[PDB]
RNA sequence: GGCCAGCAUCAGUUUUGGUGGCAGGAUAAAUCCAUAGGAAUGUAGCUUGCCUCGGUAAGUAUUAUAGCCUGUG
RNA sequence: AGAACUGGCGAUGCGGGAUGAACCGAACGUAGAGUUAAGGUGCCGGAAUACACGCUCAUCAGACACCACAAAAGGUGUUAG
RNA sequence: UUUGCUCCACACAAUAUAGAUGGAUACGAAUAAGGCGUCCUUGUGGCGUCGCUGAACCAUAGCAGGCUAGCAACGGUGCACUUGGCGGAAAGGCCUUGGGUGCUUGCUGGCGAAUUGCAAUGUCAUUUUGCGUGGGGAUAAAUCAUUUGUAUACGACUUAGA
C-alpha cells in the first residue's frame, strides 16, 4: 500500500536491580501502525536477546517528509533473500519523498529479481545532496542541462465502442 | 445506435476485433464486416503459418469428410475465430450468427455507405512500435486461397471510382463553407454564437 | 412532428446468473448512452415496458405489454437490473425494451 | 388531493383546465407570472365527474375563458413564448436525459 | 534548388515551462506548468493561478498543450506565479481554438429546453439565407 | 363488495448521494512570508581563439538585468 | 506393505478447482430483499479490454496450490547486481 | 379439372415478426505522421490553419400535426412524370434535364382542440398469403405403361415411338 515511515522506540523491561534500560529506536517502513510494531520485533530480536513478552514499545511516531515538493536523488542499500543464499544490492532512485521511494523499490525488486515483501531488508535510505557523484547510469542521464524529450506515438482511450474518424496519433 | 453498422476490416487484429463483435451480436446489433483480406495478426509471419499447419493436420481419421473443415478464405478464417466465441450450438447462437455478414473487399451495396473502425482493436493503437505483425491476405495465399490476384484487382477498380466521388464532394463542401462564411456576422449568426452553435 | 418518442430505448441483455445457474426473477437491462453507474442513479425507479405483437386480439389490440421497473445499479459499465410483474420470456435476449421517464424525480 | 391544477392556455395549445398528478410531470426552469389569475374557486369537488357526447357544461367553458384572458397578457411579454407552449416535446437521437438540463 | 527538403516532424516535447492540461483526477480540466521532470513517465507540476496544488503526477493523466514560456528549473510556487503573469498564458490560452471547443460543449450542456427551442428557431432562419446564396453562384 | 393498479403521509430492513459542525498528530508536514550561511546542471557582469554585424568559445564571477538549496524564526 | 495424533469421505448435498467419493469455502424446512466466502471480471459467462511500476519474443513461448510434468549442464539473447 | 394461369393498381379478410419508432451520413493512404486551405518555379514545394473524439453534423414547431388571411422571396422539399447518362463483385442503385402539382415555421395574424375525466404501449410499421372487383397478357411439359443396352442387384441411367 502507501507506505508510511514510522519511528518505534523500545524499552526491554523495568526490573528490580536493573532500572532504566537504555532505549532503542528504529525507522520502519510499513503500510500501517500495527505492522510496524510487529516489524520492530522482527529486527530487534536479531540484534540482542529480547522478546515481545519481555518487551514493551515506548512510543510510535509518523515521520512526514521534510520537503515533499523538492526532488531528491536517493541511494538505497538493500539486503535480500534469493533462492540461493542472501546477498547485498545498492540501487538508486530519483523520486519525490522518502516514503514514496521505497514504494518504487519493492516494485523494482519484484519485477527484476522476483523478491516479495518478506525477503527484502532495507538497510539505509540516503539522500545524495550534491550531484555528479551518482554512481548508476540510468539515474545520471536525467541530470543533463536543458533536458527535453518528446513523447511520440500517443494512444487515445475512447469510451464509445465505434469511432468514425479513422483515428490518428500525435 | 444504428440499424446496420459496417466495420472496415483494415488494420485490425483478428482476436481483439472478434471479441467486441461477438458481444454486439449477442446484444442484437447487426454487424457487417468488409475488407477482410487486410486484417492483421500479431507475431511474425513464420509463426502464424505454423499455427495454421498444426491445425491443418487435425482431421477425423476414419473419414476425413466428417472432421474439422479447414476453411481457407480470410473471411472464413475470421468467421472461425468469431464462431468459437458465440455459443453456436444453442438457438441463441444460431440467431446471433445470422446477424453477421463478412466479406472480402467491399461488395455492393456496402461501398455507398459509411465504414467504421473499432479503436480498442486497431493495430496502431494496440501493439508497441518495432513489433512484427502478419497480414492475413498474404497468409491465406500461402495455404491455398486462389483469389488474391482477383480481389486486389477489383479494389484498384473501386478506388478510382471512389476518388471521383470524393473530389466532387470536396468541391461542394467548399461552396457551402464559403456560403456559410459570408452568411456569418448576421444578427441570426451572432445570437447562435452566444448559445454555442 | 417527425418524432414522438418520450422514452429511452434499451436492450434486454440476460438474466441475473452465476456461471451455471440463473435467476429468472431479476432481469438485466442495458440503457443506450449510459457509461458509468453515477449516471445510472438517474434511472432508478423508472418504469419499464416491453412491447410486442401477437395475432389474436384481446380487447381491441394486437399489442401487449409487460410492466416492470428499475431496482438498482449493476456492475461498473452502467448495466441496470430490473424486476417485472411476470418475468421476461427468455426469447428476448437482445430485444428493444422501453424505459419511460416517469415517475419523475425532476 | 395531491393533484396539480394546470391550464394550457386553451387557445395556445388545446389543453384545458385539468387535474394532473405531480409525479408524472417534468418541471422546467422557465417561469411566467401567475399573480393576476383568479384560480382559488377551483377545488376537488369541481372536477368530480360523478355516446351522448354532451358539451362541457357552460359553467366549464366560461371559466376557461376568464383564466386564459388574464394569462395570455403575461405570455406576450417574453419573445417566442407563445410559440414555445404551442409546439410539442420529443426526445431526438443523442438526447441523454440524465445530462439534459430541463 | 540544391537544398535538403528533409521534414521536421514537429512535436510537443516536455521541458521546464511546458504548460499542460490535467484531464482526469481531482483537478479535472485546469492548467498547470511543469516545474521539473523526474523521469520518463513522472513529472512535477504546479499551477497557482488555476488552482491545482503542487504535486507529482504521472504523464498518463496529463495532456500536452503547445504553449510554452521561460521559467527556471526547480522553481517554487511564488516564482511560477510571477512568471505566469508575465507571459499572460491565461489570455493566450483562450485565443487558441482548442480552448474554445472546450467552452462550447460546456455551454451546450447547460442549455435550457426553452433555449434549446431558441436554437431551433434561429437555425431554421439561418438555413433560409444560405440556400438562397447557394444555388445561384 | 371481487379483480388488477397509481399517488400521498408513516413503520421495519438496506443500498447510493449531497452537505454542516468538532477532535487528534512535529497542535500534521509543506507552500507562504522574515533572516543566516553555502553550492552548481553557474543568472547578470567580465577576461579571451573571438567575431556572418554579434553569436559562439571556456574561463572567471556566488544575485546583480534568473533563481534554487540548508538551518533558524 | 504396516503403525501413530487430528480432520474428512463412507452416510452429504450446495459455491469454487472445465470434468472428479477424499482439496478449497460452507454443512440443507419453504420463500423475499441485503452483504460476502473460496474463485473470478477479453468473449463464451454474471462482473474493470480499470489503474500503477517493471520484465519477457520462443522455426513446439507462457498462463495459478492438491494436478496430470520434468534433470544436470551449457547460451556476447536480454536485464538488474 | 366446369374459365384454369400471369402481371398492374384497390377492396377486404387471413397470417406472422430473434424485435422499425428523426436519418446505416461513401475517398485512399500513413501513424517517428496527416486532413484541409492558399500560392508557385506543380514538387517528397512554400505559407496559414485544424485534431487532443460522434459530447459532432444534418433534420426537427402546427389535431399522430387541422381549416384559413397575408408578406418578402424565385429559394427548399414531397410527388407522379420526363430528357439523359452511369454502375456486373451480390450491377437491382447512384445522378442529372425539363415542365406539372401540393406543401413551406423565412416573416405577421384570425379561428379549431376539452369528456381518453389524476397514468394504463393507447395501437399509425413490414412479411407471406387468400378471396372477389377492372385493366392488360400468354395457349405447355414431366412421370407410368411400351421399347433400346453405351446401362443395370431393384430404383437409377441412356435411347426410340402421333
Amino acid at each position: 500500500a502507501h507506505f508510511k515511515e514510522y519511528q518505534v522506540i523500545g524499552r526491554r523491561l523495568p526490573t528490580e536491580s536493573v532500572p532504566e534500560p537504555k532505549l532503542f529506536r528504529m525507522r520502519i517502513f510499513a503500510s500501517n501502525e500495527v505492522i510496524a510494531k510487529s516489524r520492530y520485533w522482527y529486527f530487534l530480536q536479531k540484534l540482542h536477546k529480547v522478546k515481545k513478552a519481555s518487551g514493551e514499545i515506548v512510543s510510535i511516531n509518523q515521520i512526514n517528509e521534510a520537503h515533499p515538493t523538492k526532488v531528491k536523488n536517493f541511494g538505497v542499500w538493500v539486503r535480500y533473500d534469493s533462492r540461493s543464499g542472501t546477498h547485498n544490492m545498492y540501487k538508486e532512485i530519483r523520486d519525490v519523498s522518502r516514503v514514496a521511494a521505497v514504494e518504487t523499490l519493492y516494485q523494482d525488486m519484484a519485477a527484476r529479481h522476483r523478491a516479495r515483501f518478506r525477503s527484502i531488508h532495507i538497510l539505509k535510505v540516503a539522500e545524495i545532496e550534491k550531484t555528479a557523484d551518482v554512481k548508476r547510469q540510468y539515474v545520471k542521464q536525467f541530470l543533463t542541462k536543458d533536458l527535453k524529450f518528446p513523447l511520440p506515438h500517443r494512444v487515445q482511450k475512447s469510451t464509445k465502442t465505434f469511432s468514425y474518424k479513422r483515428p490518428s496519433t500525435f | 445506435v444504428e440499424p446496420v453498422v459496417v466495420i472496415d476490416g483494415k488494420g485490425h487484429l483478428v482476436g481483439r476485433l472478434a471479441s467486441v463483435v461477438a458481444k454486439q451480436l449477442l446484444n442484437g446489433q447487426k454487424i457487417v464486416v468488409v475488407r477482410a483480406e487486410e486484417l492483421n495478426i500479431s507475431g511474425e509471419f513464420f509463426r502464424n503459418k505454423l499455427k495454421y499447419h498444426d491445425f491443418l493436420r487435425k482431421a477425423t481419421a476414419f473419414n476425413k469428410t466428417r472432421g474439422p473443415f479447414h476453411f481457407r478464405a480470410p473471411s472464413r478464417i475470421f468467421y472461425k475465430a468469431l464462431r468459437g466465441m458465440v455459443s453456436h450450438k444453442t438457438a441463441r447462437g444460431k440467431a446471433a450468427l445470422e446477424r453477421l455478414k463478412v466479406f472480402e473487399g467491399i461488395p455492393p451495396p456496402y461501398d455507398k455507405k459509411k465504414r467504421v473502425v473499432v479503436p480498442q482493436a486497431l493495430r496502431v493503437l494496440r501493439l508497441k512500435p518495432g513489433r512484427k505483425y502478419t497480414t492475413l491476405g498474404k497468409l491465406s495465399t500461402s495455404v491455398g486461397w486462389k483469389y488474391e490476384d482477383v480481389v486486389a484487382k477489383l479494389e484498384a477498380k473501386r478506388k478510382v471510382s471512389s476518388a471521383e466521388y470524393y473530389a466532387k464532394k470536396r468541391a461542394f463542401t467548399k461552396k457551402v463553407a464559403s456560403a456559410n462564411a459570408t452568411a456569418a456576422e448576421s444578427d441570426v449568426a451572432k445570437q447562435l454564437a452566444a448559445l454555442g452553435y | 412532428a417527425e418524432s414522438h418518442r418520450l422514452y429511452v430505448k434499451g436492450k434486454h441483455l440476460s438474466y441475473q446468473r452465476s456461471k451455471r445457474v440463473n435467476n429468472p426473477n431479476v432481469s438485466l437491462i442495458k440503457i443506450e448512452g449510459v457509461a458509468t453507474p453515477q449516471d445510472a442513479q438517474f434511472y432508478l425507479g423508472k418504469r419499464i415496458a416491453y412491447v410486442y405483437r401477437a395475432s389474436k386480439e384481446v380487447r381491441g389490440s394486437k399489442i401487449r405489454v409487460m410492466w416492470g421497473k428499475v431496482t438498482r445499479t449493476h456492475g461498473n459499465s452502467g448495466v441496470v437490473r430490473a424486476t417485472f410483474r411476470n418475468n421476461l420470456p427468455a426469447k428476448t435476449f437482445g430485444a428493444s425494451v422501453r424505459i419511460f421517464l416517469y415517475p419523475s424525480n425532476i | 388531493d395531491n393533484t396539480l391544477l394546470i391550464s394550457g392556455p386553451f387557445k395556445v395549445n388545446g389543453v384545458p383546465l385539468r387535474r394532473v398528478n405531480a409525479r408524472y410531470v417534468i418541471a422546467t426552469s422557465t417561469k411566467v407570472s401567475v399573480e393576476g389569475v383568479n384560480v382559488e374557486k377551483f377545488n376537488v369537488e369541481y372536477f368530480a365527474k360523478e355516446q351522448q357526447n354532451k358539451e362541457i357544461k357552460a359553467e366549464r367553458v366560461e371559466d376557461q375563458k376568464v383564466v386564459d384572458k388574464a394569462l395570455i397578457a403575461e405570455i406576450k411579454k417574453t419573445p417566442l413564448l407563445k410559440q414555445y407552449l404551442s409546439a410539442s416535446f420529443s426526445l431526438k437521437n443523442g438526447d441523454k436525459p440524465h445530462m439534459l438540463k430541463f | 534548388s540544391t537544398d535538403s527538403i528533409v521534414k521536421a516532424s514537429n512535436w510537443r516535447l516536455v521541458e521546464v515551462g511546458r504548460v499542460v492540461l490535467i484531464k482526469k483526477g481531482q483537478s479535472a480540466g485546469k492548467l498547470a506548468a511543469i516545474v521539473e521532470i523526474i523521469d520518463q513517465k513522472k513529472v512535477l507540476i504546479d499551477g497557482p493561478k488555476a488552482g491545482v496544488p503542487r504535486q507529482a503526477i504521472n504523464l498518463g493523466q496529463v495532456v500536452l498543450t503547445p504553449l510554452t514560456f521561460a521559467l527556471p528549473r526547480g522553481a517554487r510556487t511564488a516564482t511560477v506565479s510571477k512568471k505566469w503573469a508575465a507571459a499572460a498564458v491565461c489570455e493566450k490560452w483562450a485565443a487558441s481554438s482548442w480552448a474554445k471547443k472546450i467552452a462550447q460543449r460546456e455551454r451546450r450542456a447547460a442549455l435550457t429546453d426553452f433555449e434549446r427551442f431558441q436554437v431551433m428557431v434561429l437555425r431554421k432562419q439561418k438555413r433560409y439565407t444560405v440556400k438562397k446564396a447557394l444555388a445561384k453562384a
Side-chain angles (χ1 to χ4, degrees):
Chain A
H2 293 92
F3 291 98
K4 295 180 178 66
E5 186 173 2
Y6 282 155
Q7 172 182 359
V8 181
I9 299 169
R11 193 270 312 276
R12 185 181 188 275
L13 276 177
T15 65
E16 190 178 4
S17 69
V18 183
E20 290 181 351
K22 286 177 90 284
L23 254 66
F24 287 133
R25 75 177 295 273
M26 289 182 67
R27 298 175 71 92
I28 298 299
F29 292 106
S31 64
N32 58 5
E33 182 178 358
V34 183
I35 294 170
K37 291 194 288 184
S38 179
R39 181 59 63 189
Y40 177 73
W41 295 109
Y42 177 75
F43 299 112
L44 204 276
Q45 282 188 357
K46 287 184 174 65
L47 294 172
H48 52 83
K49 188 184 291 292
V50 299
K51 286 167 67 178
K52 189 179 186 295
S54 66
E56 72 174 0
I57 295 98
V58 177
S59 178
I60 45 95
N61 300 118
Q62 184 177 1
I63 296 172
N64 299 114
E65 186 66 33
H67 297 285
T69 64
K70 193 259 189 71
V71 177
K72 292 177 257 73
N73 292 319
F74 283 152
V76 183
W77 286 264
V78 171
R79 183 260 187 90
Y80 74 104
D81 290 329
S82 175
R83 294 176 185 176
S84 297
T86 182
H87 48 277
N88 287 318
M89 186 173 287
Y90 170 74
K91 288 174 68 66
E92 288 175 349
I93 302 169
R94 181 178 176 88
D95 205 0
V96 169
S97 67
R98 287 180 61 89
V99 80
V102 183
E103 176 70 25
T104 63
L105 184 134
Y106 284 162
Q107 299 299 108
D108 197 356
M109 290 296 292
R112 286 177 173 88
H113 299 282
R114 295 289 198 273
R116 284 90 170 92
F117 174 73
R118 61 185 183 270
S119 295
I120 302 169
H121 293 83
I122 301 298
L123 305 180
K124 181 168 71 70
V125 174
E127 179 181 359
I128 299 170
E129 293 87 3
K130 295 180 177 67
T131 61
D133 51 357
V134 171
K135 182 175 172 66
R136 294 279 86 83
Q137 184 68 41
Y138 56 91
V139 182
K140 191 174 183 178
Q141 66 178 356
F142 293 103
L143 299 180
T144 61
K145 61 184 289 185
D146 291 330
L147 185 60
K148 295 182 285 185
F149 59 96
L151 295 172
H153 192 77
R154 66 175 173 90
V155 298
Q156 189 63 255
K157 302 299 288 183
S158 66
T159 61
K160 289 175 95 288
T161 59
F162 295 104
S163 179
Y164 299 165
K165 198 182 262 77
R166 185 72 190 175
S168 179
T169 180
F170 197 82
Chain B
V1 71
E2 295 182 356
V4 171
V5 174
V6 183
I7 294 175
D8 194 358
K10 188 254 177 65
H12 290 83
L13 300 172
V14 170
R16 293 184 183 272
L17 176 63
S19 176
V20 307
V21 173
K23 187 64 173 177
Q24 300 292 321
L25 296 175
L26 295 173
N27 296 329
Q29 187 64 44
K30 296 181 177 66
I31 288 178
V32 47
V33 172
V34 298
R35 292 177 71 189
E37 74 273 13
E38 297 287 327
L39 194 56
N40 293 116
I41 300 172
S42 65
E44 63 178 359
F45 179 73
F46 194 74
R47 287 190 57 83
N48 293 319
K49 186 176 181 180
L50 271 73
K51 286 184 181 178
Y52 194 77
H53 278 172
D54 58 353
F55 174 70
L56 189 65
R57 64 188 293 273
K58 290 180 173 65
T60 293
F62 57 90
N63 192 2
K64 296 293 194 293
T65 305
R66 302 178 65 186
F69 295 104
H70 309 93
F71 288 102
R72 266 75 167 179
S75 67
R76 292 288 92 191
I77 288 176
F78 173 70
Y79 179 73
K80 175 191 173 189
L82 197 146
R83 175 259 187 92
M85 291 178 182
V86 182
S87 178
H88 67 282
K89 287 184 180 181
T90 62
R92 185 172 184 264
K94 295 181 178 67
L97 293 173
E98 293 180 354
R99 299 183 180 96
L100 181 67
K101 297 179 186 293
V102 183
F103 298 107
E104 294 88 0
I106 297 176
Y110 295 106
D111 55 353
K112 300 293 189 291
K113 272 78 174 177
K114 180 71 173 178
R115 277 89 68 187
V116 309
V117 293
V118 179
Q120 58 185 354
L122 265 300
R123 184 193 69 191
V124 77
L125 300 182
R126 180 61 59 190
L127 280 80
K128 189 174 75 174
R131 183 66 183 86
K132 283 90 178 66
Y133 62 93
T134 296
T135 301
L136 190 65
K138 186 178 180 180
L139 181 60
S140 295
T141 306
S142 66
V143 291
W145 183 64
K146 68 277 282 184
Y147 287 98
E148 194 183 3
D149 292 331
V150 175
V151 179
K153 184 177 179 179
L154 295 178
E155 292 294 323
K157 185 186 287 186
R158 202 275 314 279
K159 291 177 184 290
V160 178
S161 295
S162 177
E164 293 180 355
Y165 173 69
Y166 185 73
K168 286 173 91 286
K169 185 175 181 180
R170 187 178 64 193
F172 181 74
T173 56
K174 188 183 290 184
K175 287 172 68 176
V176 174
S178 68
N180 198 1
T182 186
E185 192 63 28
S186 67
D187 296 332
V188 66
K190 300 300 293 295
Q191 290 181 355
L192 286 175
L195 297 179
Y197 286 88
Chain C
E2 63 183 1
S3 64
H4 300 90
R5 180 174 64 86
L6 293 172
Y7 58 91
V8 178
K9 63 181 73 175
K11 298 292 186 181
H12 182 198
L13 298 183
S14 178
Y15 285 166
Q16 178 179 6
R17 60 178 290 164
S18 297
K19 190 181 263 78
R20 287 180 179 90
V21 167
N22 55 4
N23 189 359
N25 287 316
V26 174
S27 300
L28 297 172
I29 298 300
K30 177 68 176 176
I31 300 169
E32 288 185 354
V34 172
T36 58
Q38 289 85 15
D39 296 333
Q41 290 299 111
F42 177 73
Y43 295 100
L44 298 179
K46 300 294 187 289
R47 300 292 296 164
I48 304 171
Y50 175 68
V51 175
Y52 64 100
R53 293 181 182 270
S55 295
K56 182 179 76 174
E57 60 183 4
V58 283
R59 287 181 183 271
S61 177
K62 293 182 181 292
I63 301 170
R64 298 172 184 174
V65 165
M66 301 177 194
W67 289 103
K69 63 186 181 180
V70 168
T71 61
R72 60 181 291 169
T73 60
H74 183 74
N76 284 318
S77 296
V79 187
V80 165
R81 292 183 186 176
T83 60
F84 292 87
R85 296 181 185 180
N86 295 323
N87 299 321
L88 293 187
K91 196 177 284 187
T92 69
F93 297 107
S96 294
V97 188
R98 297 179 181 177
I99 291 95
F100 291 100
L101 298 174
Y102 60 93
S104 175
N105 198 9
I106 301 169
Chain D
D1 58 355
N2 297 320
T3 62
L4 300 181
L5 194 274
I6 46 94
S7 67
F10 182 72
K11 185 56 69 182
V12 176
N13 56 3
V15 176
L17 291 167
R18 184 182 173 90
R19 295 188 291 119
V20 166
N21 196 359
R23 185 54 65 91
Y24 288 148
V25 167
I26 291 169
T28 62
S29 68
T30 59
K31 294 182 179 181
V32 303
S33 178
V34 75
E35 185 180 2
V37 196
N38 202 8
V39 199
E40 186 181 1
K41 71 181 180 181
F42 291 149
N43 52 4
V44 180
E45 192 180 2
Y46 182 75
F47 296 101
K49 68 179 182 180
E50 192 267 330
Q51 176 285 333
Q52 176 173 149
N53 192 164
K54 61 298 179 182
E55 296 57 21
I56 310 175
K57 304 294 182 182
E59 181 182 1
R60 181 68 62 84
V61 179
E62 291 294 325
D63 290 330
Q64 186 70 47
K65 292 181 181 180
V66 175
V67 172
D68 292 335
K69 285 178 186 177
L71 192 61
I72 297 300
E74 179 65 29
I75 288 171
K76 288 184 183 292
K77 293 189 283 186
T78 59
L80 291 173
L81 205 280
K82 184 179 183 295
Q83 286 83 17
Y84 178 72
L85 301 180
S86 64
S88 296
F89 175 74
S90 69
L91 295 177
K92 277 79 178 175
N93 298 118
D95 291 335
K96 293 182 286 184
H98 55 277
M99 291 178 69
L100 288 177
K101 182 178 177 181
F102 285 153
Chain E
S1 177
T2 60
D3 299 329
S4 299
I5 321 294
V6 176
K7 295 283 103 175
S9 180
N10 194 0
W11 275 342
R12 303 170 189 169
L13 70 163
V14 298
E15 64 180 2
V16 179
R18 174 73 68 181
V19 69
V20 293
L21 178 62
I22 299 171
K23 59 181 182 293
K24 64 181 182 178
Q26 180 59 254
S27 300
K30 291 181 180 180
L31 291 172
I34 294 172
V35 174
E36 185 178 3
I37 46 98
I38 296 167
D39 55 352
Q40 293 300 113
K41 296 180 185 294
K42 292 176 71 175
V43 293
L44 184 66
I45 62 171
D46 194 1
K49 181 67 183 294
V52 50
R54 184 173 178 179
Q55 67 189 359
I57 201 165
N58 193 359
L59 285 172
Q61 295 178 358
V62 77
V63 72
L64 292 171
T65 66
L67 305 175
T68 58
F69 64 100
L71 183 141
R73 51 100 56 215
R76 300 170 72 89
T77 304
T79 306
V80 173
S81 178
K82 186 169 72 175
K83 297 289 187 180
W84 189 267
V89 292
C90 294
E91 181 64 31
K92 190 183 289 187
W93 176 249
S96 66
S97 177
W98 178 45
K100 292 181 180 181
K101 185 62 64 67
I102 293 169
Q104 186 178 2
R105 67 173 61 93
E106 179 177 358
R107 176 61 182 270
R108 289 187 182 178
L111 292 177
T112 311
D113 184 75
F114 177 71
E115 293 181 354
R116 193 178 300 116
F117 183 75
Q118 286 187 356
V119 169
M120 175 181 171
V121 181
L122 293 177
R123 294 176 70 251
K124 297 293 285 294
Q125 294 181 358
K126 185 178 179 181
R127 77 172 69 186
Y128 184 76
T129 61
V130 174
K131 296 293 181 70
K132 289 193 290 185
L134 190 147
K136 286 174 70 176

